[PDB]
Amino acid sequence: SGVEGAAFQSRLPHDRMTSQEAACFPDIISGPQQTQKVFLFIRNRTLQLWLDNPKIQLTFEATLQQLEAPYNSDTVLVHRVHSYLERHGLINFGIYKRIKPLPTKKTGKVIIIGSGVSGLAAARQLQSFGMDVTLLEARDRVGGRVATFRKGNYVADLGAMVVTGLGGNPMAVVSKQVNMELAKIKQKCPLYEANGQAVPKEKDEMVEQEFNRLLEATSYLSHQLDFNVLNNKPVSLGQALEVVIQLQEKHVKDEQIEHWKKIVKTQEELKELLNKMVNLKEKIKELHQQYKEASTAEFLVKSKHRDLTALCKEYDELAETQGKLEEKLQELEANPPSDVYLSSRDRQILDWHFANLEFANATPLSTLSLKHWDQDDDFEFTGSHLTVRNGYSCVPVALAEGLDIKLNTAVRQVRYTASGCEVIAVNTRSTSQTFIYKCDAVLCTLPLGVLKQQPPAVQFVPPLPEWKTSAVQRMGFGNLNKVVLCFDRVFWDPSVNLFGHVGSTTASRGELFLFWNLYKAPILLALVAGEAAGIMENISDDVIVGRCLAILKGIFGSSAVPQPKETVVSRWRADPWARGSYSYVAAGSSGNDYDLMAQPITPGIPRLFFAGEHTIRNYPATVHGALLSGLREAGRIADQFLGAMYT
Ligand SMILES: Cc1cc2nc3c(=O)[nH]c(=O)nc-3n(C[C@H](O)[C@H](O)[C@H](O)COP(=O)(O)OP(=O)(O)OC[C@H]3O[C@@H](n4cnc5c(N)ncnc54)[C@H](O)[C@@H]3O)c2cc1C
Ligand SMILES: [Hg+2]
Ligand SMILES: [Hg+2]
Ligand SMILES: [Hg+2]
Numbered sequence: 001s002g003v004e005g006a007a008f009q010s011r012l013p014h015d016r017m018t019s020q021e022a023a024c025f026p027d028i029i030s031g032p033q034q035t036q037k038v039f040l041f042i043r044n045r046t047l048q049l050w051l052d053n054p055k056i057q058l059t060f061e062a063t064l065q066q067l068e069a070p071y072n073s074d075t076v077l078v079h080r081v082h083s084y085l086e087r088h089g090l091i092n093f094g095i096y097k098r099i100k101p102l103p104t105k106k107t108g109k110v111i112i113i114g115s116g117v118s119g120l121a122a123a124r125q126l127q128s129f130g131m132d133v134t135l136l137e138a139r140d141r142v143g144g145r146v147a148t149f150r151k152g153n154y155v156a157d158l159g160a161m162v163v164t165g166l167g168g169n170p171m172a173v174v175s176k177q178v179n180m181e182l183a184k185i186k187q188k189c190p191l192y193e194a195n196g197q198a199v200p201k202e203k204d205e206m207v208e209q210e211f212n213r214l215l216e217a218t219s220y221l222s223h224q225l226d227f228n229v230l231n232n233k234p235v236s237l238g239q240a241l242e243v244v245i246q247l248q249e250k251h252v253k254d255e256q257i258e259h260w261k262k263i264v265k266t267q268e269e270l271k272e273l274l275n276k277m278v279n280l281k282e283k284i285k286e287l288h289q290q291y292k293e294a295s296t297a298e299f300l301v302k303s304k305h306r307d308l309t310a311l312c313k314e315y316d317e318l319a320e321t322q323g324k325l326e327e328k329l330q331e332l333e334a335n336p337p338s339d340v341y342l343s344s345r346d347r348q349i350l351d352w353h354f355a356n357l358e359f360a361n362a363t364p365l366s367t368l369s370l371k372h373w374d375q376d377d378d379f380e381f382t383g384s385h386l387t388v389r390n391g392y393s394c395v396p397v398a399l400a401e402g403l404d405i406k407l408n409t410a411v412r413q414v415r416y417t418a419s420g421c422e423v424i425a426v427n428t429r430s431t432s433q434t435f436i437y438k439c440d441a442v443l444c445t446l447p448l449g450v451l452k453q454q455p456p457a458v459q460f461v462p463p464l465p466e467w468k469t470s471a472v473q474r475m476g477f478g479n480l481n482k483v484v485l486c487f488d489r490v491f492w493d494p495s496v497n498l499f500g501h502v503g504s505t506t507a508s509r510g511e512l513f514l515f516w517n518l519y520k521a522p523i524l525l526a527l528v529a530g531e532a533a534g535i536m537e538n539i540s541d542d543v544i545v546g547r548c549l550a551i552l553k554g555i556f557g558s559s560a561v562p563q564p565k566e567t568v569v570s571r572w573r574a575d576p577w578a579r580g581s582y583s584y585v586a587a588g589s590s591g592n593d594y595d596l597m598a599q600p601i602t603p604g605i606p607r608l609f610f611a612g613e614h615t616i617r618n619y620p621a622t623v624h625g626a627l628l629s630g631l632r633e634a635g636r637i638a639d640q641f642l643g644a645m646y647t
Contacts, residue, residue, distance in 0.1 A: 006047035010090050011168045011379075014044055024084050025647035042071055042081045050091035054173040057099045058091050080647045087638070087645055089125055089631030094174045095398055098128075106132040108641045111423045111437050113411050113458075114445035116144030117623050118612040120399040121630025122443055127403055129638045134437065135403060136425050138410030139577050143396030145447070145613075146623060149484060149568050154521045155391040156484045158570040160623045161518075161525075163388065165381025170631075171624045178398040182386035183518070186497035191352060192555040193502045199349060207346055211353040217244040218370065228371045234587035237373055238365035241354070249341045256337055263332045270325055277318045284311040351509035352502045358510050359529035362478030362581035362621070372585040379618040387497075387518045392623075409435060414442055415461035416607040422461075440641060441607055443633055448597075448614035449477040449579025457576075462603055471596040475614065476586030479533045479573045483512065483526035483548055486566030490522045491556060501551045508532045512548055524552075534573050541569040582621035583614040591617050598629070606640060609633045 007014035017040065022030055029036040049066060050058045060082045064072050072078065085091045108131050112119050115137035126133045141147075149156035163182055166172040175182060191199045218240045221227040227243075228235050291304040342350060358365055361373060388394070408429045415422035423437040450457050451472050464472075492499075498516050503509035510530025517524055526548050528536045536544060545567050553561035572578050585591070594617040601608040611633040612626055619625030639645075 003041065003044045003048050006051050007044045009051055009168050009172070010047045012043075012047070012090075015040065020088070021084070024645045025080070028647040038071065038074075039077065039081065042067070042078060043085070045071070046082060046085055046091060050085075051173065054094060054096055054177050056097050059099055062099075077647070080645075084645050084647075088635050092128065093121075093125065093170070093631055094177050095124070095401065096177060102127065103130040106130060108132060108441070109439040110134070110441050110443060110637065111136065111421075111439040112443040112445060113414075113423070114138070114144060114447075115142040115396075115400065115405050116445055116447075116612065116626060117146060117396060117399075118615075118626040118630035119144070119443075119445040120396055120403075121627040122445070122611055122634040123403045123405075124399065125631055125634030126638065129634070129642070131638065131641070133403060134439075135405040136409050136411050136423065136437065137405055137407050138425070138428070140408050140429060142400045142405060142407075143393050144445075145578060145582070145626075146392045146396050148391035148393035150391060150393075151486075151566060154486045154523060154566060155389075155519060156523070156525070156568060157388065157392050158482055158484070158568065160392050161387060163386045164622070165383045165385065167382030169381045169383075169624055170627055174395055174399075174627070178394050180394045181389040183389050185385050185387055185518075186495070188496055189498045189500060190496070191349065191500045191502055193345070193348070194504050194554075196555040198555075199502070203346070203349065207342075207349045208353060210342070210346075211350060214241060214244050214248075215357075217247075219374075222370050235370040236366050236587040237368035237370045239587075240370045241365060245341070252338055252341045256339065259332065259337050263329070266325060266329050266332065270322065270329065273318060273322060273325070277315070277322065280311065280315055280318065284308065284315060287311060347506070348502050348504075348509075351506050352500055352513055354506075355503060355510040355513045355530050356500075358531075359480060359514065359527060361584045362480040362529070362533075363476060363584045363586075364531045367476060367478075367584070367586055369585045369587045369589060372590045375585060375591045376618050376620055389519070395623075406435075411458055413459050413461070414444075414608070416442065416601075416603050418603045418605075421607045441609060441637055443637065444608065444610045445612050445630075446610075447477075447578055447580075447612065448472070448475060448583050450577070452477060453579060460608070465601060467596060468599070468601065471589075471593040474586065474589045475593045475597070476584040476589060477580045477614075478582065478584045479537075479580040481528045481533055481537060481570040481572055482568075483528065483544055483570075484566075484568035485524045485526065485545065485548060485564045487522035487524070487564055488562050490517075491561055492517060492524065499555075501555065508535075511536065512551055515552075524548075537571040537573050541567055544569055584621065594620055598632070600633075600636070609637055 004014040012018060017025075017030070017036065021043070025039065029039045045067065046058070046063050049063060060079050063082050064075060064078050066072075067078065082091075110126055110131055110133050112123055112133060112135045115123070115135045119135055119137070120142060123133050123135055143159070145159040147157075147159040149158055162185070163169070163171055163175065191204055193199055218237065221240050221243065222235070227240065230239075287304065287308050291301070291308055294304070295301050354365055361368055406425075409425040409427050411423055411425045413424040415424070420438060420440060421442050423439065423442060425435050425437065426433060427435065446458065494517075497518065498514060500514050501512055503511060503513055508531070511528055511532040512526045513529065514527045515524050516527065545564060549561055553559045572580050583594075594615065597610055598615045598617075600606045600610070611629040613621055613629070616625040616629040616632070619628055
């Protein structure tokens with residue numbers, strides 16, 4: 001119904017109790033039988049109230065004076081539940097019209113490094129929780145990896161772009177709090193070969209099926225044959241993909257020989273029978289004559305014929321088998337089995353499919369861990385993916401509308417004593433060059449690519465533990481850029497949301513393999529994935545944009561493709577503040593390292609906390625994952641520097 005709906009939108013079992021909820025309400029409800037029944041209801045009921053209007057602060061009081069006959073009778077458990085929820089950011093999170101103003105007297109000082117979605121997400125929580133929160137963004141703007149290009153009437157989105165489902169997506173709440181227009185993505189997508197050729201629907205279907213076919217084989221080798229460690233080395237997805245393919249290439253060369261074989265075993269039978277026949281032609285030739293000339297004419301001529309009968313008559317089975325066989329020799333030479341697994345043209349189309357996976361996981365397929373690159377799948381939201389029409393930057397800007405964000409300052413050192421901790425940052429685009437932030441706790445929102453920067457970029461007085469950094473280095477941070485093309489008008493099909501360009505070579509199959517049309521203005525978004533992404537980051541926007549034009553008027557109008565009025569090209573590897581797209585499970589790593597990343601570090605009570613895209617295990621590499629990780633720490637921190645929820 002409706003109350004049980006909210007539970008789902010909150011990623012919570014409706015009739016069950018979270019491992020967490022169990023803890024905060026220790027048998028106080030995990031004791032009797034039908035007393036928890038009530039509990040859960042009071043939970044879902046609130047979850048519902050909040051969700052039905054996340055543009056306002058859902059008060060304990062408001063929650064109370066809105067419950068049914070029983071429930072609101074026991075005023076105490078309600079509060080218990082409400083606080084619990086409000087603490088974990090299941091209600092009153094994001095940006096809402098606050099009732100009951102913040103406490104002028106804040107408690108504790110928290111320094112949050114970076115102001116990405118996880119940063120802002122956390123910030124606000126803590127703020128609301130009644131704490132002193134200051135964000136140090138080293139980038140003249142908020143939103144980090146949610147970067148939107150805004151020039152005149154054009155809107156682009158070089159960072160996050162898609163909102164993958166609204167089924168249990170916290171982003172569904174934020175999205176309506178901010179009044180951000182989302183739009184569904186037309187699945188239809190046509191593939192144009194490296195010539196413009198639209199690729200016949202049937203070929204596109206066979207190959208794509210053979211893609212899903214291959215990929216699933218891969219899954220079998222992994223989860224059914226434990227083909228995860230070959231030669232004390234970790235198996236990568238791409239490694240396995242190449243195994244399965246090579247195996248189907250085997251079946252082909254195989255049933256190819258079973259054929260050639262029996263064609264020959266028959267060619268030999270006719271030749272072995274032709275001799276038997278040519279040899280019988282003599283016997284029926286030597287006799288046939290001694291018959292006519294010796295036609296002695298008593299019981300003799302009566303027999304030469306009895307003889308010639310048998311011979312001419314046995315010469316029938318031969319000439320009869322000959323045909324039979326001689327003709328079956330055609331049921332073979334006339335119907336060969338497939339001579340090749342995939343045509344050179346096929347593979348290229350197949351590669352596009354690979355590139356499309358590389359685009360998703362933001363890393364060459366070779367880099368992926370055969371066993372865990374899927375690991376998070378069990379939590380994907382329900383409902384179709386949407387595009388933001390007015391620019392994703394809405395969310396972050398909106399979310400920053402009330403906190404003190406120390407922009408343009410770059411944290412280059414983090415100190416943490418058993419007691420307080422110091423943060424030293426530098427300024428860059430404003431008269432300064434050295435600051436020092438003293439505070440109780442540090443919330444690190446630094447992207448995995450930065451924590452990986454060799455040099456490195458930021459230092460941690462007591463160095464980060466063994467376990468930590470070793471996890472940081474074995475995880476994966478990928479890359480993937482975009483090529484924005486602002487035009488004079490639409491020269492492409494308006495009812496199509498996306499179309500692909502088949503690549504030339506397996507390597508560089510990700511080179512501008514997918515154009516994207518999602519806006520009002522005449523604007524296409526070109527994608528560079530796979531190993532092409534990093535390399536391409538070394539070319540002029542001009543040259544890159546030129547390769548786009550070709551492919552374009554190559555598939556469209558005979559040079560009936562205008563000159564882009566405007567143009568942008570992203571380079572996330574280079575961005576010193578990002579160092580790549582987002583994480584991915586690399587061969588050797590696993591879903592555990594995401595957990596170790598969340599792990600707070602305590603000096604020789606905890607000081608250093610981490611959040612961000614690379615911190616959240618079942619929602620990595622996403623904006624909602626970042627936001628959830630954000631809320632998570634915000635809560636965790638306030639449980640130590642304030643108190644823990646009871647029942
Ligand atoms: C091309 C591309 C496409 C994507 N598409 C999607 C998509 O469709 N959907 C989706 O859900 N996700 C997508 N993502 C990823 C998503 O945007 C990120 O996962 C998310 O923004 C990460 O959140 P974060 O809070 O960790 O912040 P950022 O990743 O926002 O990280 C922290 C912030 O700190 C700043 N900072 C860095 N170094 C320092 C320093 N030394 N001192 C101080 N501040 C510093 C950064 O500039 C940044 O603002 C995409 C990413 C890329 C690159
Ligand atoms: Hg397509
Ligand atoms: Hg197979
Ligand atoms: Hg906005």
